[PDB]
Structure 1
Amino acid sequence: ATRAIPELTKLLNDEDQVVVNKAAVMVHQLSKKEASRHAIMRSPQMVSAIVRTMQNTNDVETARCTAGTLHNLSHHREGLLAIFKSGGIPALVKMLGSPVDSVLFYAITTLHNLLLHQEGAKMAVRLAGGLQKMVALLNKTNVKFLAITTDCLQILAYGNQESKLIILASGGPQALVNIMRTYTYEKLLWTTSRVLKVLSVCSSNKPAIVEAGGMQALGLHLTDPSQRLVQNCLWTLRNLSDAATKQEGMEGLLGTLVQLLGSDDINVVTCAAGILSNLTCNNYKNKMMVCQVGGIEALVRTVLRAGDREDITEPAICALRHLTSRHQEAEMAQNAVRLHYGLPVVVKLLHPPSHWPLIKATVGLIRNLALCPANHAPLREQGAIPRLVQLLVRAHQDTQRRVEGVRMEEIVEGCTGALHILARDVHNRIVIRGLNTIPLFVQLLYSPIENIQRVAAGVLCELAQDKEAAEAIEAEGATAPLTELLHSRNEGVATYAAAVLFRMSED
C-alpha cells in the first residue's frame, strides 16, 4: 500500500511501444484502491507522467487507463488540485477528439468535476479550446455522456458572453436544438434547456436558436411531468419569442401555451402570457390559431384571476390587444372579450394602482374592442370614456410642461385613438363632447407627431358630424390648423382634416 511507489513513474514516462503501455495498466489498478490513491496524488513527477502519455499514445488501453486514472483521481479536492497544478486540462481537452467512447466518457467527467469544484478551471478550459471540442461532441448518442457535456457548456457559458459567442460560431444552437427534439431523458433535456436559456439572452444566439427550430423543439416539453424542465423551457421560449414572428409549424406550441394559461403556477402563467403576447404581434396566422383554440377565453380568465399582478395582466392584455385586430377572426375575438365578461376588468385596469405599461396596453385593447359595434354601449356603461379623457388630459399636460418606460406622447395617441373609435356611436359622442374635449382635440392638431394629428383630426371628424359639435369645432378656431394639415405627408392626416373642413363649412 504505502511505501513502494515512484517505480511505475519511470516506465510510464518511457519512450517505448510496450514499456509505458503495460506500465500504465498499473497506476490504473492502484488508483481504484480508495485510501491507496489518496496518497498517489503526491508526486508531481507521477501526476505529470500520466498526462504526457495520454496526450501522445496509440494504445486504446493506454488511453482508457490514463484517463480513467485522472477520472478516478478527480474526487478529492487534493485530487483535483493535482490534475490542475500538473496541467491536464489542455490534454484532457485534447482527449475530446478521440474516437473511443470510453476515453470520451473519462475526459468529459474529469473536466466536469474540475469545472465544478476546482478554482480557475473555467478559464483554462476556455483557453484550451474546450468549448469547440464540447460542441462537436453534441452529435453523440449516449444520454449520460451528453448530459455531462451539456452541463460543462452551461457552466462555461453562464455569465460569459465570449463563451456564448464561441458556442454560436461552433454551431451550438442547432446541436442543442437537435438534442431537445431527439431525447427523452429528463436530466439531459434539463441541462440542455439551461444551456439554451443562457444563450437565449444573447443578441446573436437568439435568432440562430430560432432559425434552428428552437421554439418548436422547446414546445415539445411543455407537458413534461418535470416542472424544472417545463419552466426552463418557458423562460427560454420567452426570451426567444420576440424573434420568432416568422416561424411556422407553431400550431402545437400555441395550443399548449393557451392550456398553460390555466396553470396554478404563477411563473408558468406569466411565461405563457408573454410568449403568446410576442408570437401574436403582427403574425396574423398565430392570431388565428390562438383564437381557434380558445385563447380569448383563457386570456380573459387569466386577467380576471391575476387581479393586480402586473407581470401577468400586462402581457395578457397585450396578447388580447393583438388578438382583437387585423386578422380574419378579429371581429369574433372583439365580441368574445365581452361574452366572457372581460369589459369591466379591462376598464378597471385603466385606474390606479396600474402602472404605465399596463395602462398603455389596456388603452390599445380598448381601441380594438371599440371596433365592434356591440361593445360601444358596454364600454360607455363601464366608464371607459371619462377615464380615457382624464388619462389624455393629464398626459397632454405632462408633454407641454416639460415616464416609466413609456412616453406620455404614446398615452396621448393611444387615448385619442381609442376615443376616435368610440366616437362612432352617437351616445358616445354626447359623453365625449360633454367632457369639454373639443378644445383639447384642436390643440392636438398642432402636435409635432403625425399619428397624434391623425387620431385628433379623426376624432374631430367623428364629432363634426353633429351640427352642434361642428359649430363648436369651428369656434375653437380649427379652420386654420386643419388648413395646414391638408398638406400633411400623412394621407390619414390630410383626409381627416378635409372631412372636418367639409362638415364645418356646410354654412
Structure 2
Amino acid sequence: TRAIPELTKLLNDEDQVVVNKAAVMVHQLSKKEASRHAIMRSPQMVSAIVRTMQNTNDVETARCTAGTLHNLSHHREGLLAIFKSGGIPALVKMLGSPVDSVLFYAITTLHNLLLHQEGAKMAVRLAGGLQKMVALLNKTNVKFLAITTDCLQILAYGNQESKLIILASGGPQALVNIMRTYTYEKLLWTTSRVLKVLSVCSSNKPAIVEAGGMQALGLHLTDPSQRLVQNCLWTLRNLSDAATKQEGMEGLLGTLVQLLGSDDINVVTCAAGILSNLTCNNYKNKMMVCQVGGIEALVRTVLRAGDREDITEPAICALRHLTSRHQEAEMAQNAVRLHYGLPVVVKLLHPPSHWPLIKATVGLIRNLALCPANHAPLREQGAIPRLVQLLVRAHQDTQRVRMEEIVEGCTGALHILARDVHNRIVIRGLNTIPLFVQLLYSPIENIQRVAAGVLCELAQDKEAAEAIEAEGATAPLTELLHSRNEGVATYAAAVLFRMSED
C-alpha cells in the first residue's frame, strides 16, 4: 500500500528507462496475492499499468504490464478494476502487438472479462475488438486460436450486431480454414460453435457456403467427439437450407449418405435433413447423391424409421427430390422398388402419418409412378385406393401443408398411375369421375391441369369417355379451353375430343 502511490509515479514517469523499472517491480509484486489485491484496489496504480501497456515501447515493459493485468484478471474484483481503468480498449490495442508474450496476456485477459465482467462484450465491440480478433485467427498456436474463437463466440452469441462485423472482417473464411487445418478438438469445437452462431444470420450464411465451409464441416461428422459432430450437423443444417450450388460437394454428399446408416438415430436424422436440403432443386447434387448409393440408403433409412416422422419426412422428401427431373432419376425410381421401398412408402400414406409427411409421400408416389415398372407394384400395394380416399377428404375440407395441396397431390399422382390400363380399371372402379370432373372448377389452374389429365387418360376408352361426358364434363372443359395455361387448355381438348362422334 505504501510503495503504491510511489510506484504509480514511476510508471507515469517520463522516461522508459524509469518506467521499465516500475513495470518489472509491479508485475513481480503482482504475484503474491497479498500485494495483488492492493494493486487492484488502487484506481491510480491500475490506471498506470493500463496506460503504460498501450503506450510503452519497451517489450519488457509491455509484457510485464500486460502480465500484471493478466494476474489481476483471476479475481472477479480485479476484472472490475481493469474494466473501470480503460483496460479493455488497452488490451484490444495490444491485439496488434507482434510479440507473443504480449499477444497472449492480452487475449486471455479479454477472455476472463468476456466471461465474468458485465458490460465487457460491449466495451470489446466498441473498441474494435472483433476485427483485431478475426485477424488473429491467422496465428498458428492452437490454444491461442482456441481462446480467441471462444471470445468471438462469446461476443457473437445472440448479437446480430457482432455477427455482421465478424462477416465484414472475413470471419467466415478464417473459421473455415481452421476447420480444414487443425486437429486439436477443443479448437475445432469452439470454431464450429462460432460458425453455428453465424449460420442463422441471413448475411453470414451465404459467405460460409462460399468459403466452402459446408465441405469443411463434413470432415468432422464422424469425429469421436460427439459435441463436435453435433455442432457441425446443426451448422450444416442451417446452411444446407438455401444454397448456391457449390462444387466439391461430392465428398460431403458421400459422407452424408454414409451417416444415413449410423447406429445413432439422431445422426441419421440430420444427415437425412441435410440431404433433403442439398437436393431440393439441384440436378447436380441429385446426380452425385444417387450414385453414392443414396437411393439405397434413403429407402433403407425409411424401413428402419418406422412411425418416427422425425426421420421419415426428410427421408421421403429426399427420395421425391431424387426421383425427378434429372439423368439419374429414371433409375432412382426403379431403385426405390428393387430395395423394397414401395411397400413401406404406400404404408406411410395411412395414419398415424401427419400431413407434412403425407404430402411428401404422395409426391414420392407420383414420381415413382413415372416409371412403368412401378405401375403394377404400386397398384398391388393399394396406392390408388388410399390416394382417392385422401383426395376425397382433402377436397371436402376445401368445400366444408394446406388441403388444396393434397388435392393437387393425389390427382397428380392418380394422373400418372392412370397411365396403366389396369390402374384405370381401378380408378374408374372407385367411381371417381364425378370428382375429377368437379375438380375442373377448382380456382387453381394446377388442379385443373391434373384433373383434365386424369380425365384424358380415362377418356382413352369410348366407355369411360361417355361416362365422363354424361357427368357434365363438357361445359367446364370448353370453358377450360381458353385457360391462359397451355397444359390445362391442351388436356381440356384431348378430352372434349375423346368424348365425341355422335
Normalization by structure 1: what TM-score? 0.96
1:442/1:478 contact within 8 Å kept: yes
Query: Matches of 1:87 and 1:432 in 2, distance apart?
Result: 80
2:92/2:127 contact within 8 Å kept: yes
Query: Matches of 1:472 and 1:136 in 2, distance apart?
Result: 76
Query: After the TM superposition, which residues 283-294 of structure 1 pair with which residues of structure 2 at under 5 Å, given as runs?
Result: 283-294=282-293
Give the C-alpha shift of residue 4 in structure 1: 4.7
Give the C-alpha shift of residue 292 in structure 1: 1.2
Query: Matches of 1:425 and 1:434 in 2, distance apart?
Result: 14
Give the C-alpha shift of residue 112 in structure 1: 0.6
Segment drifting more, 464-473 vs 250-259 = 464-473
Give the C-alpha shift of residue 269 in structure 1: 1.1
Give the C-alpha shift of residue 28 in structure 1: 1.0
2:4/2:45 contact within 8 Å kept: no
Give the C-alpha shift of residue 296 in structure 1: 1.3
2:369/2:413 contact within 8 Å kept: yes
Query: Matches of 1:318 and 1:124 in 2, distance apart?
Result: 47
Q: How many residues align?
A: 501
Query: Matches of 1:483 and 1:102 in 2, distance apart?
Result: 85
Q: Over residues 427-459 of structure 1, what are the superposed CA-to-partner deviations in whole Å (9 max), with x where a residue is unaligned?
A: 211221122221111111112221111111111
1:245/1:279 contact within 8 Å kept: no
Give the C-alpha shift of residue 264 in structure 1: 2.1
Query: Matches of 2:23 and 2:423 in 1, distance apart?
Result: 91
Give the C-alpha shift of residue 242 in structure 1: 2.4
Q: Over residues 255-283 of structure 1, what are the superposed CA-to-partner deviations in whole Å (9 max), with x where a residue is unaligned?
A: 11011011122331111001111111221
Query: Matches of 1:259 and 1:45 in 2, distance apart?
Result: 62
2:56 is paired with a residue whose SS is: coil
Normalization by structure 2: what TM-score? 0.97
Segment drifting more, 310-319 vs 86-95 = 86-95
1:190/1:228 contact within 8 Å kept: yes
2:121 is paired with a residue whose SS is: helix
1:297/1:336 contact within 8 Å kept: yes
Q: Over residues 199-243 of structure 1, what are the superposed CA-to-partner deviations in whole Å (9 max), with x where a residue is unaligned?
A: 111111111111111111112222322221122111111111123
User: What is the match of residue 260 of structure 1?
Assistant: 259
Q: Over residues 381-412 of structure 1, what are the superposed CA-to-partner deviations in whole Å (9 max), with x where a residue is unaligned?
A: 21211111121111112222xxxxx1212111
1:245/1:282 contact within 8 Å kept: no
For structure 2, which runs of at least 5 residues remain unmatched after alignment? none
Give the C-alpha shift of residue 29 in structure 1: 1.0
Q: Over residues 37-74 of structure 1, what are the superposed CA-to-partner deviations in whole Å (9 max), with x where a residue is unaligned?
A: 24432111111111111121211111111111111211
1:210/1:243 contact within 8 Å kept: no
Give the C-alpha shift of residue 426 in structure 1: 1.4
Query: Matches of 1:47 and 1:277 in 2, distance apart?
Result: 57
User: What is the match of residue 459 of structure 2?
Assistant: 464
User: What is the match of residue 188 of structure 1?
Assistant: 187
Segment drifting more, 470-479 vs 123-132 = 123-132
Q: Is the aligned partner of 1:486 residue 2:481?
A: yes
Query: Matches of 1:35 and 1:295 in 2, distance apart?
Result: 66
Give the C-alpha shift of residue 5 in structure 1: 3.9
Query: Matches of 1:104 and 1:342 in 2, distance apart?
Result: 59
Closer/same/farther in 2, CA of residues 506 and 225 from structure 1, 3 Å limit: farther
Give the C-alpha shift of residue 181 in structure 1: 1.4
Query: Matches of 1:115 and 1:32 in 2, distance apart?
Result: 23
1:245/1:283 contact within 8 Å kept: no
Q: Over residues 89-117 of structure 1, what are the superposed CA-to-partner deviations in whole Å (9 max), with x where a residue is unaligned?
A: 11111212222222111111111111112
For structure 1, which runs of at least 5 residues remain unmatched after alignment? 401-405
1:18 is paired with a residue whose SS is: helix
Give the C-alpha shift of residue 245 in structure 1: 4.6
Query: Matches of 2:244 and 2:474 in 1, distance apart?
Result: 44
1:370 is paired with a residue whose SS is: helix
Query: After the TM superposition, which residues 98-497 of structure 1 pair with which residues of structure 2 at under 5 Å, given as runs?
Result: 98-400=97-399, 406-497=401-492
Query: Matches of 2:438 and 2:105 in 1, distance apart?
Result: 75
2:23/2:64 contact within 8 Å kept: yes
Give the C-alpha shift of residue 35 in structure 1: 4.5
Query: Matches of 2:244 and 2:129 in 1, distance apart?
Result: 34
Amino-acid identity (%): 100
Give the C-alpha shift of residue 345 in structure 1: 1.4
Query: Matches of 1:43 and 1:315 in 2, distance apart?
Result: 62
Segment drifting more, 98-107 vs 366-375 = 98-107
Query: Matches of 2:230 and 2:365 in 1, distance apart?
Result: 32
